[PDB]
Structure formats: structure tokens, C-alpha cells
């Protein structure tokens, strides 16, 4: 197989505090207490939306950390993904250890046995290890399959799937509201 | 049976209103009362009234009352829309009133091909006063058409099937425009 780092850019964010920029998640510098995104508050919604350079089967997410334990670290978070910003699919619900060790998590990337691609990944912090302090994310690395020979047929399948679901739900909702 | 009849309505939403020129003033036909009108707060868009019928109906006409004298606030141009909900309403009429003291009645679009369709909401959108200066004013509105449930219910059933087809067409058009 091949599994590759999937580059991304920061696309949207709920908020940020001071100089704790969304873009700080791009670099792994546990050596620097300011190299993180921090939300402005812990009240929802808070999130970062990452836009991949190209669509990919997004298989893992890796979170870096600070050199020491940190109150702002995410005790709980969710990850969503989709081909656009709206209607994203939940890919993961978990949490980080409050330590200085990088952690990698498998993301949902199949429906039944068929792989599906994302263009956007949304990280939703839910709980900090110390309840008061803003949510912080130090570093995010996405990995998966970006080989077009795999991604393209998955995109084709997934476009049809989402179209069928849109229709089914369009009519379901149309008929409920009548 | 199936006479064109007055269709009662209530005021549902409005863009704005000036001072005591309430949206509800369109419910009463009092041509000697200069204050018996809805007036928008300004003429900048969008301005509108949305009327909610008591029951769904085939809305066939709209009648506008007037003041006893000519008035600058009278609608030189206006449009009317209607729908089963407030969103995605259909244009039913684009016209204008005479600057006189005569009530005017206009036929509204109420068929798609040969099939009648019903509305629950009617939106009146003033566009021009006679009038360039003064705010948009509406003195009195009367809706008329068929509200006999033996006509309206089957028409609603058909229209739901029609709207479902259009929803599907547009859903796929919009899904496919976003590759």
C-alpha cells in the first residue's frame, strides 16, 4: 500500500485568541508554547476547518502536543469530513491523553466496505483537560490515500451515493413538511 | 357552490411600517380615513407585506382599495407572490395601480397549465409610488378565490406532486452544479 501525508490549508475557523492562529496547527514545534491554535472561548460552536489540496481518502489524523502537559489540550473532540463544508460526516469521536506524546487516530473512511473521499476536515474540540482554559490544538497531520487512481473512482461512487441520499432525504423532508 | 368568494387573511410578516400606519390597516376599507393604511418606513428594498390566509385556497384575485382622494403614496408598480410556505413563492402578478380613488381588482396567476394550485401565503411587494417621493402605502386588500375544501384538498395533493418533481429537478441541478 501507500499512505501519505495529505497537505491542507486552514479554510475556516470559529475564532482564535491573540496570536494563537489557526495556521499554527501546520507546524510541529513542541519547543514553542505559542505554536498552537487557541479558541477565543469554550462556548460552542468552536472548530477548525481544513481544506485539503486535493480530495483524498483521509485515513488517520495525528495530533502533536506541547513539550509538557497543558491545560488547553483536548480531552474530548470530534472530527468530521466531507466533499464540502456543509453536511459533513462524523469520522471520529475521541480524546487526547494529557501528555507530550503525538497521537494518531483512525478516521472512518468507508461506508459499508466502500472507501469515500473528503476535501474538507472539521475538527471540533469539546472538552479541555482543564475546563476553564480555551481549546488548543498544537499540530495536525492528516494521512491517507491521495493517489488519483484510487481517489477518482471513490469520488465517482461517492458522488452517486450522496446524490441518491440527497434525493431520498429531499423527498423525505418534503413529505414530512406537508 | 364554487363562487369566487372573499378569502380571509391575517398579517403575517412585514418589512417595516411607519408610525401608526400599521400592516393591519389593509384589513379595513375606510376610504375617508387618511390614516387607514399600511405605510412602509422607507422605499428602499426590500419592502413587503406577507398575508396568511386562514385556510389554503386557490387565490384568484387581489383587490386594492384607495383613499377618497388621489394620493402620492399609491403603488404605481407592485408585484404579488404566493406560496404554500413563505419560502420559494411564485410570482402571481406584476402590475400597477391607477392614481385615482377607484378600487381595482387584478386576476392573479392561479394555474400551472390547466391545473389550479393553492396558496397559504400571499406577499405583496410595492416597487414604485406615484409618488416617487413618499413611502409605499396600501389602503385595503381583499383576496378572493376558491376555498371550498372539496376543490382545495385535491388541488393541494396534485400541487404537492408537482412541487416534488420540481424539488427533485432542482435538487439534482444544484447537487450537480457543485460537481
Question: Which structural domains are found in chain B, ordered by start?
Answer: 1-179 (2.60.120.260)
3-state secondary structure of B94: strand
Check A163 against B172: CB less than 8 A apart: yes
Q: Say how far apart CA A4 and CA A150 lie, in whole Å.
A: 13
Cβ contacts of B133 within 8 Å, gap of 6 or more: B72
CA distance A79 to A92: 5
Residue with cell 382622494: B69
Taking the CA of residue A153 and the nearest CA in chain B, the distance in Å comes to 14
Query: Which three three-digit cell numbers place residue A17?
Result: 485568541
User: What does the buried/exposed string (b/e) look like for B148-159 if buried means 16 or more CB atoms within 10 Å of the residue's CB?
Assistant: eeebbeebbeeb
The contacts of residue B104 (CB under 8 Å, 6+ apart) are: B63, B64, B66, B97, B98
Which among A162, A163, A171 has CB closest to B164?
A: A171
For residue B177, which of A149, A84, A116 has the smallest C-alpha distance? A84
Annotated resolution, angstroms: 1.8
Query: Among residues B90, B57, B71, which one has the least CA distance to residue B139?
Result: B71
Angle at CA A167, nearest 5°, toward B160 and A165?
Answer: 150
Stated as kind and residue range, the H or E segment containing B175 is helix B149-177
Structure-solving method: X-ray
Give A91's DSSP letter: E
User: Residue A120 forms beta bridges with which residues?
Assistant: A51, A82
Tell me if chain A has a CB within 8 Å of the CB of B168: yes
A71 touches chain B (CB under 8 A): no
Separation between Cα atoms, residue A127 and residue A41, nearest integer Å:
12
Residue A163: list chain B partners with CB under 8 A. 172, 175-176
Residues of A with Cβ-Cβ distance to B83 under 8 angstroms: none
Cβ of residue B4 closer than 8 Å to a chain A Cβ = no
Question: What size, in residues, is chain B?
Answer: 179
Cβ proximity of B146 and B2 under 8 Å:
yes
Dist CA A131 CA B129 (whole Å): 59
Amino acid at each position: 500500500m501507500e499512505c501519505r501525508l495529505l497537505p491542507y490549508a486552514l479554510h475556516k475557523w470559529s475564532s482564535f485568541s491573540s496570536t494563537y492562529l489557526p495556521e499554527n496547527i501546520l507546524v510541529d514545534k513542541p519547543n514553542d508554547q505559542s505554536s498552537r491554535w487557541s479558541s477565543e472561548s469554550n462556548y460552542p460552536p468552536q472548530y477548525l476547518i481544513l481544506k485539503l489540496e486535493r480530495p483524498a481518502i483521509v485515513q488517520n489524523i495525528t495530533f502533536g502536543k506541547y513539550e509538557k502537559t497543558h491545560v488547553c489540550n483536548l480531552k474530548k473532540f470530534k472530527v468530521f469530513g466531507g466533499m464540502n463544508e456543509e453536511n459533513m460526516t462524523e469520522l471520529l469521536s475521541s480524546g487526547l491523553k494529557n501528555d507530550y506524546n503525538k497521537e494518531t487516530f483512525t478516521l472512518k473512511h468507508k461506508i459499508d466496505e466502500q472507501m469515500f473521499p473528503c476535501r474538507f476536515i472539521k475538527i471540533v474540540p469539546l472538552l479541555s483537560w482543564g475546563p476553564s482554559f480555551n481549546f488548543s490544538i498544537w499540530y495536525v497531520e492528516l494521512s491517507g490515500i491521495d493517489d488519483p487512481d484510487i481517489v477518482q473512482p471513490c469520488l465517482n461512487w461517492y458522488s452517486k451515493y450522496r446524490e441518491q441520499e440527497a434525493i431520498r432525504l429531499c423527498l423525505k423532508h418534503f413529505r414530512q413538511h406537508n
